[PDB]
RNA sequence: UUUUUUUUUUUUUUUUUUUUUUUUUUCUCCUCUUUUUUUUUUUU
């Protein structure tokens, strides 16, 4: 959310993402558009689970629809 | 009744070349609660 992105900096490489089913952990990915996609569902993938992190790594894949409209 | 003389616009042209997007950082990060997980069946 915004008030916790304006504090990430404004060129915040690393970011944390919240999945949609409770069965999945959170994923560590690096992007540079977080401050203009805060009203959209997105898609990510997974490349490697690393042990010096508590989370698994990923990378953005493609955009999805908008949170609020049926589509 | 007032003669004679005091030069002028720098000279030159017939020289070789075998490279190549960019370029250089920012850390670890507590996801709250009825559950085992339901399940045949038929009309698309």
From Swiss-Prot:
Residues 15-71 form the CSD2 domain. It is found in: Cytoplasm. Catalytic component of the RNA exosome complex which has 3'->5' exoribonuclease activity and participates in a multitude of cellular RNA processing and degradation events. In the cytoplasm, the RNA exosome complex is involved in general mRNA turnover and specifically degrades inherently unstable mRNAs containing AU-rich elements (AREs) within their 3' untranslated regions, and in RNA surveillance pathways, preventing translation of aberrant mRNAs. It seems to be involved in degradation of histone mRNA. Belongs to the RNR ribonuclease family. Component of the RNA exosome complex. The catalytically inactive RNA exosome core (Exo-9) complex is believed to associate with catalytic subunits EXOSC10, and DIS3 or DIS3L in cytoplasmic- and nuclear-specific RNA exosome complex forms. This is DIS3-like exonuclease 1. It comes from Homo sapiens (Human). The lineage of its organism: Eukaryota, Metazoa, Chordata, Craniata, Vertebrata.
